[PDB]
Amino acid sequence: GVPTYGAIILDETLENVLLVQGYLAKSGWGFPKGKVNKEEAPHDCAAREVFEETGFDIKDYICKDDYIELRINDQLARLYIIPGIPKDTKFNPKTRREIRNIEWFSIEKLPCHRNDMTPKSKLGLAPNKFFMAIPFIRPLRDWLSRRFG
Numbered sequence: 001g002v003p004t005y006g007a008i009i010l011d012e013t014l015e016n017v018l019l020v021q022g023y024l025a026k027s028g029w030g031f032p033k034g035k036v037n038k039e040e041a042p043h044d045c046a047a048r049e050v051f052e053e054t055g056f057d058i059k060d061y062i063c064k065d066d067y068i069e070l071r072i073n074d075q076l077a078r079l080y081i082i083p084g085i086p087k088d089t090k091f092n093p094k095t096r097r098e099i100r101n102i103e104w105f106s107i108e109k110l111p112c113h114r115n116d117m118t119p120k121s122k123l124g125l126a127p128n129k130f131f132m133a134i135p136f137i138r139p140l141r142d143w144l145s146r147r148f149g
């Protein structure tokens, strides 16, 4: 599958992360990201997708080696880590037919897995509106502990 690139934006306290909420198949909350165009460099794709979904330009803030990358069902997703963005920043998507809402979430309150259905003796996982964000949460928490303390 085509690689995706975007960002994990944190505030100045490093407590909170910025998630966006799409529509339909993308109806839950997730980090801003999208598919790379032909010949486009990973940092440029990240900035483009982030600016389209949030109105915030990360290009002056990206650090090349500061990202979390996950391969999920043989598609690679790389989110550049962008700390220190003020919580009073005004975010507005360009793509308002694609983005319902944009919010800060407490990192410590976000799930890092979905819940099973063992109460009901049924296989699988319960729905969770943070499905797309979840795979990045534990790697983010570990990354912040190493790089800040």
Ligand SMILES: Cn1cc(C(=O)NCc2ccc(Cl)cc2)cn1
Residues within 6 Å of the ligand: 020, 021, 022, 023, 025, 026, 027, 028, 029, 030, 031, 032, 033, 034, 053, 098, 099, 131, 132
């Ligand atoms: C299958 N699926 C994907 C998501 C997701 O990515 N959500 C955040 C988001 C990112 C970018 C845009 Cl444009 C819209 C929403 C949710 N469920």
